[PDB]
Amino acid sequence: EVQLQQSGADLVKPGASVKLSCTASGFNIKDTYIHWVKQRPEQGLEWIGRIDPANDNFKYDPKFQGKATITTDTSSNTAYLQLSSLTSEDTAVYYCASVITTTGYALDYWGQGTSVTVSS
Amino acid sequence: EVQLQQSGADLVKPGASVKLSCTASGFNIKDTYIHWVKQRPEQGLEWIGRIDPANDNFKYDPKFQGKATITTDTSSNTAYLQLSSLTSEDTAVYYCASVITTTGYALDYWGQGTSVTVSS
Amino acid sequence: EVQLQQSGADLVKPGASVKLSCTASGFNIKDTYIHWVKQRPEQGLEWIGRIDPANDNFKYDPKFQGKATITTDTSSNTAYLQLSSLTSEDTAVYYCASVITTTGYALDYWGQGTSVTVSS
Amino acid sequence: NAQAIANMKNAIQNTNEAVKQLQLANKQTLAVIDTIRGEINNNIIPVINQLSKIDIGNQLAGINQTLQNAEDYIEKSEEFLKGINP
Amino acid sequence: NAQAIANMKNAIQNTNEAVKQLQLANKQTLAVIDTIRGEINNNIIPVINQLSKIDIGNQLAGINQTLQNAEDYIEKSEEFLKGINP
Amino acid sequence: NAQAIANMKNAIQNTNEAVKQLQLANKQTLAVIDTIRGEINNNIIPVINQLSKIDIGNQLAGINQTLQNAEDYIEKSEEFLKGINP
Amino acid sequence: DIQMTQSPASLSASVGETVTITCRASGNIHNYLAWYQQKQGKSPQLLVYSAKTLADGVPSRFSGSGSGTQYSLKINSLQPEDFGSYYCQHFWSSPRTFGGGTKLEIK
Amino acid sequence: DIQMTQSPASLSASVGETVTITCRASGNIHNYLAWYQQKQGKSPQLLVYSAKTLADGVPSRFSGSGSGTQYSLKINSLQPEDFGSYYCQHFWSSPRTFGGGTKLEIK
Amino acid sequence: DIQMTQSPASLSASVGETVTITCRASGNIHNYLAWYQQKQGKSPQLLVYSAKTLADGVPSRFSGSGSGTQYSLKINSLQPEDFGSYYCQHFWSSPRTFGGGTKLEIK
Ligand SMILES: *[C@@H]1O[C@H](CO)[C@@H](O)[C@H](O)[C@H]1NC(C)=O
Ligand SMILES: *[C@@H]1O[C@H](CO)[C@@H](O)[C@H](O)[C@H]1NC(C)=O
Ligand SMILES: *[C@@H]1O[C@H](CO)[C@@H](O)[C@H](O)[C@H]1NC(C)=O
């Protein structure tokens, strides 16, 4: 069936770089959009941005434009989120989400999420 | 089957307001255009105007722009023509017509017509 | 099946006019594009131009704009290439070609070609 | 009918690309208008002030009709689409 | 579903004709801009040189938003088309 | 294939909305051109007459190519549509 | 706007005769022309659409053609049932007006 | 940009009660609004899309409506399983942001 | 306009050898490139279209790829029947011209 398998559990020092990732099963990455969402422990959800794997067409929420980027490897049906200059605020849970059936309207499938923390 | 059932037989005094109406059977008003046509006893046909029930988008022949308006109730599959400031010329037969199969080309179904007269 | 049957074997004097032609079988000319190509004996291929029989919309390579024109008769599924002011360079083989299955990408079917020569 | 689906999809995508190109042309047009305004506002007006017809009605009328035709075609497009639901 | 195919084909063709009409409007617009530039460059500037504000910011802002809306609609069009391959 | 029909219909409708927005942008553009013409014709010309270069060639060339690209895309759209009848 | 001119005001023909009705436009209709027929009473009905077609259920006796601003309807082998009033209208832009109409009588 | 305001910060209701959650936009979303639900842990899931529909598998207890910049979700006959956090987001243009969210507790 | 450059004028190879033919554009073709083959006589036929595909009926020996303005065709395990002239042309805008062509001989 259709699902997103997300991975990572990065414990890093301030100033570190972090790469989080997810893989697809049941569908081709090329035919869908991949979105990333950041959930701070107790503060709702912030949309980060998304990509179109067909042509590596990316778009980000201005808030994170200088903070993180999103890339992909179509040939392996995978997607990546690269975070840079990690600080205390970044501790959080990141989600990989995609639009499969509800095309043009809503995020459909979600990964289980990955937790990344920053500490001394 | 598909048909338009038109009604009214208004006998009014000069200066009166008249509301003529038609109902649909066999189809959904929301998926079609409704047109109204005015036939004076012996003088051919004049197009009045039409509406798109999906969004109440109306358009009228300038000649009748200040004379009559067209409205609708989608939930009951009905349509209405409201005539105002009736005078002697208005005595006539009005027709409810719609485009069902000949989409983009021609009026297809017609009601039987309603006669409205103005007298002292 | 689908094929183009090309004809002609014109031996003309310099300054003469020549009309070359092809007929279609297995398909309707109205639904396809007809292209013409000129092959000089030992010098590769030059595209001449093409027409859209649906509306007689023609387009030519500027090199031959004042040299030849392309026309058609939809009712008989035929196409014509009219060459004018024939000189020594024009001796060549002309091909009738069309796009049948590879729509939007490539010339698909070709005629066997017609040879026209110019001599004193 | 699978080929018809593929062909319509490709046809729509090319229509959308043509629209993108017109949008770019319009942004470039504004840059030109602003450039002309700039020179008038920066040099022509100040100099005249220190010291102290254009008839295009036929061209504007031509443009107004061309734009109206675009409206007539879109309206017809919408009428045909309503016939899909049946 | 054969009628749906026919209706979509006709709808696409009318969309394309509307696009052609906008292109023509843009070419005519440039002719107007060049005509105005011509008169300024040919008579206004030379005369001032022999002898020796325009505020449209609100209008340009309005145009910028209208053009942006066109982008928002095309982007949505593309998202729907991706759902065809499945 | 019913979903493909629904998706193409929605995609076409969004294309048409984008076209409507470009038309509006063009009408607003003409208003700006006429506003500039107005000020030139009403104040600049009369004052100079009482008292008595603009080079945008590179920008116009850029616009001409952008408009041509729009034509190249529509032509390709039409070629694909012809493959539907078969 | 685009207006329609129905040239024949009235036609007179016997049964079995062939007649024609011509309609012209004040502008380019892009072939969106349709023809209607009406009896002495009742509503009108659609006979030909797209100015080159037949409406469903219409006898082969009725046909037509045209282009540009010039269109026409032909009626072959007139039967008693074919005598009535004819109208032409267009579906391009707006208003979608009608021509004056032609009355065909038996005589 | 277009931001979402989730008005109720927290709701408190017993089982069997009816509650509503309202969400407003800073701009016109053209009905591209969707609602999500999240438990104390795990990922969120889609409950209603297009702001007038139900997502597949969602109980009839959940419904909603709206237009313009004003939208809402209704929950009828609350069951113990319906208590959790709700979010609203839009899919028009960009950024496709989220509202603050509403927490519904049992009491 | 957009012109095509066929770089190899002539290739010489024995049977079983692998050869390549390269073609470059003076402008962006948007991947609308197609390859053709012609014998000493007769008409040419289509071998690869869209510059990344195979035409129906064409042996797996023929393949190709490319992007931008740089495209190529590969021929693996050459057989006696594969020796002839090759051409490249584009289908973007107009004129839809051809490259000079490459002649592959047996030796
Ligand atoms: C052209 O249309 C505009 C409205 O978009 C109008 O203001 C202007 O007066 C029209 N031009 C002429 C010559 O009527
Ligand atoms: C309108 O957009 C253009 C870019 O296309 C920009 O250069 C210009 O400054 C903008 N106008 C205003 C008032 O911001
Ligand atoms: C741009 O195209 C127009 C025709 O639409 C032409 O009149 C003008 O001279 C062209 N501009 C240049 C720099 O060639």
DSSP chain I: ---EEE--SEEEE-TT--EEEEEEESS--TT-EEEEEE-SSS--EEEE-TTT---TT--TTEEEEEETTEEEEEE-S--GGG-SEEEEEE-SSS---B---EEEEE-
* Interchain proximity B111–G43, CB inside 8 Å: yes
Strand-pair partners of I74: I20, I63
H103 in any annotated domain: no
Q: Report residue A48 as tokens.
A: 């980060």
Decide the pairing of beta strands G10-13 and G102-106: parallel
Same domain, F11 and F34: yes
Number of other residues whose CB lies within 10 A of the CB of residue D44: 19
Same domain, F46 and F65: no
Residue with the smallest CA separation from ligand 3 atom 2 is F64
Distance E60 CA to ligand 2 centre (A): 7
**Is the beta carbon of E60 within 6 A of some atom in ligand 2?**
yes
Of B59, B61, B110, the CB nearest to G44: B110
Distance CA C78, CA C84 (A): 20
DSSP C66: T
CATH 3.40.50.970 fits B3-113, yes or no: no
CB I66 within 8 A of CB I33: yes
Instruction: Report how far apart, in Å, the C-alpha atoms of A68 and of each of A60, A63, A89, I11 are.
Output: 9, 10, 14, 51
| 3-state class (DSSP) for residue B54 | coil
| Single-letter residue type at A38 | K
D40 in any annotated domain: yes
CB E66 within 8 A of CB D30: no
* Interchain proximity F85–C103, CB inside 8 Å: no
CA dihedral A72, A75, A76, A82 (to 10 degrees): -10
CA dihedral D64, D66, D68, D72 (to 10 degrees): 170
| 3-state class (DSSP) for residue G96 | coil
D13 in any annotated domain: yes
Measured between alpha carbons, how far apart are the two ends of chain E, in Å?
A: 18
Q: Which residue shows structure tokens 């050898």?
A: I17
Closest ligand 2 atom to E61 CA: 13
Q: What are phi and psi of C67, to 5 degrees?
A: -110, -35
CATH number for region C3-118: 2.60.40.10
Sheet holding I4-6, edge to edge: I4-6, I19-25, I70-75, I62-67
**Contact partners, residue I80, CB within 8 Å, separation at least 6:** I15, I106
Three-state secondary structure along E39-52? HHHHHHHHHHHHHC
Interface of H with E in 37-96 (CB under 8 A): 92-93
Segments forming the whole domain that contains residue E20: 2-52+54-81
Q: Report residue G73 as tokens.
A: 């309807």
* Interchain proximity B33–D82, CB inside 8 Å: yes
D86 in any annotated domain: no
CATH number for the domain that contains residue H89:
2.60.40.10
**G103: distance to nearest CA of chain D, Å?**
32
Question: Looking at chain F, which residue has its C-alpha nearest residue E59?
Answer: F32
The CA-based diameter of chain E, rounded to the nearest angstrom, is: 75
Q: Report residue B97 as tokens.
A: 């017509």
| 3-state class (DSSP) for residue F63 | helix
Distance CA G85, CA G83 (A): 7
| 3-state class (DSSP) for residue A2 | coil
DSSP G34: E
Strands (DSSP E) along chain B, which ranges? 3-7, 11-12, 18-25, 34-39, 46-52, 57-60, 68-73, 78-83, 92-98, 109-110, 114-118
E86 in any annotated domain: no
Distance CA H82, CA H73 (A): 13
Decide the pairing of beta strands H102-106 and H10-13: parallel
Instruction: Report how far apart, in Å, the C-alpha atoms of B117 and of each of B37, B91, B114, F21 are.
Output: 16, 4, 10, 45
Interface of A with H in 9-28 (CB under 8 A): none
CB H16 within 8 A of CB H28: no
I106 in any annotated domain: no
- Residue E51 gets the label, from left (phi > 0), alpha (psi -120 to 50) or beta, of alpha
Same domain, F72 and F47: no
Measured between alpha carbons, how far apart are the two ends of chain F, in Å?
A: 18
| 3-state class (DSSP) for residue A99 | coil
Method: cryo-EM
Same domain, F42 and F29: yes
Crossing angle of helices F2-39 and E57-81, rounded to 10°? 170
**A104: distance to nearest CA of chain H, Å?**
8
Q: What are phi and psi of G5, to 5 degrees?
A: -110, 120
Q: What angle do CA H26, H29, H34 make, to 5 degrees?
A: 105
| Single-letter residue type at C14 | P
H or E segment to which residue G74 belongs: strand G70-75
H or E segment to which residue C46 belongs: strand C46-52
Residue E12's nearest CA partner among F78, D18, D6, G29 is: F78
Number of other residues whose CB lies within 10 A of the CB of residue I85: 17
Segments forming the whole domain that contains residue H14: 4-98
Distance CA B81, CA B20 (A): 5
Question: Looking at chain F, which residue has its C-alpha nearest residue I95?
Answer: F72
DSSP G25: E
Residue A97's nearest CA partner among E74, H38, H86, H26 is: H38
How many CA atoms does the CB half-sphere of B111 hold within 13 Å? 28
I70 in any annotated domain: yes
H106 in any annotated domain: no
Q: Report residue A74 as tokens.
A: 């179509």
Strand-pair partners of G19: G75
Instruction: Report how far apart, in Å, the C-alpha atoms of G70 and of each of E17, H38, I95 are.
Output: 23, 67, 37
